[PDB]
């Protein structure tokens, strides 16, 4: 009965649109650091942005071991490639 | 002096590291049919239950217990019907998980006072040694023998230390069929208790 | 800055009393499947129990990728050792 209730984590406009191609919030980017995880119930990665602050967090049903793991590789190698700061 | 237990028995007794390790919580359970077996209780008197409201009270089966009724004792007419179950209980907790069994038909509170007896629904249940939890349910305020006391305090995790003493837990739940996940308890009782005893088969 | 705000998981009181090595919630045994991680600034773990459900999180300044994949693999693998499902 192991779940993983959250996984969340936070950037800054900018970085986010460094680390998505570009585009803003709402939209993943297929060729972005948060596409290509493994999808069991829908999109992996839910990004939402109300301030300058944007939260990424991981699906509801997607939260698995793999997709926890991944996304951790990713923004370390994205947050090393681009000199962002990984404060956490 | 230990020489009377090979005259008695004809073995020597075995002593393991800790006292006390081996001893049942219950001296033992006559399975004879027709016999009653009653909970850990403070004072078997009538009081009147909130209806609608699941009532959890501890079991103890110390032993391996083979039951076929589940028995509760009524005070006071009250016109009405009620319900009755056995469920497990989670150690980690003390909370009721799974529903073990519950009776066939609603039992009727009023009439007379007495003892009503409900036949379970899978007939004849063999409890192994654990926690269990009777579950009573009722659709008016019947009036059912056991209150609260300070002898069953420690089994109830209290907001306060009361001063008349606690009894058991209460659930919100329409009347009706129990159901096989035991609704989670959100208060302790402070005055009813009711008692649910296991008959024997 | 890249921060992670929440890594939290959510197991019962008895599959973690089999990965804590028998001890209860709040304690961290070394020898368990909780202890070994990198420590950043105290206690890279933190457990807390209610009604009958335990849960674990990363301490507050010490939710670098590393912690994360690793607190993810090692739920992994005791689940799968254990026989544990991983519902999430």
Chains 1, 3 share one sequence.
Not at chain 2, 47 to 69: E, L, P, S
Not at chain 2, 71 to 86: D, E, I, K, P, Y
Not at chain 2, 101 to 125: F, K, M, P
Not at chain 2, 139 to 149: E, K, R, S, W, Y
Request: proline residues 7%; glycine residues 8%.
């Amino acid at each position: 009965a192991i779940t993983c209730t959250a996984c969340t984590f936070t950037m800054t406009d900018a970085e986010f649109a460094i680390l998505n191609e570009g585009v803003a919030a709402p939209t993943i980017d297929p060729r972005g650091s948060f596409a290509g995880l493994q999808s069991l119930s829908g999109a992996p990665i839910t990004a939402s942005a109300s301030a300058g602050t944007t939260t990424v967090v991981v699906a509801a049903s997607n939260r698995n071991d793999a997709n926890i793991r991944t996304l951790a590789q990713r923004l370390r190698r994205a947050a090393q490639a681009n000199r962002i700061t990984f404060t956490a | 002096s230990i020489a009377w237990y090979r005259e008695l028995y004809g073995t020597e007794p075995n002593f393991n590291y800790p006292n006390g390790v081996l001893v049942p919580n219950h001296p033992g359970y006559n399975q004879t049919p027709g016999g009653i077996y009653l909970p850990n209780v403070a004072a078997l008197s009538g009081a009147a239950i909130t209806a609608n409201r699941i009532h959890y009270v501890y079991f103890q089966v110390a032993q391996t217990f083979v039951t076929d009724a589940l028995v509760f004792r009524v005070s006071t007419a009250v016109t009405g019907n009620a319900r009755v179950g056995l469920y497990t209980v989670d150690p980690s907790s003390g909370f009721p998980q799974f529903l073990v069994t519950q009776g066939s038909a609603a039992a009727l509170t009023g009439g007379s006072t007495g003892d009503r007896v409900v036949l379970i629904n899978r007939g004849i249940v063999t409890l192994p040694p654990t926690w269990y939890m009777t579950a009573i349910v009722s659709d008016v305020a019947a009036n059912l023998a056991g209150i609260n006391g300070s002898a069953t305090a420690q089994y109830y995790r209290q907001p306060s230390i009361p001063s008349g003493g606690s009894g058991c837990y209460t659930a919100p739940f329409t009347y009706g069929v129990l159901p096989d996940l035991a609704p989670t308890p959100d208060a302790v009782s402070t005055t009813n208790h009711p008692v649910v005893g296991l008959r024997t088969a």
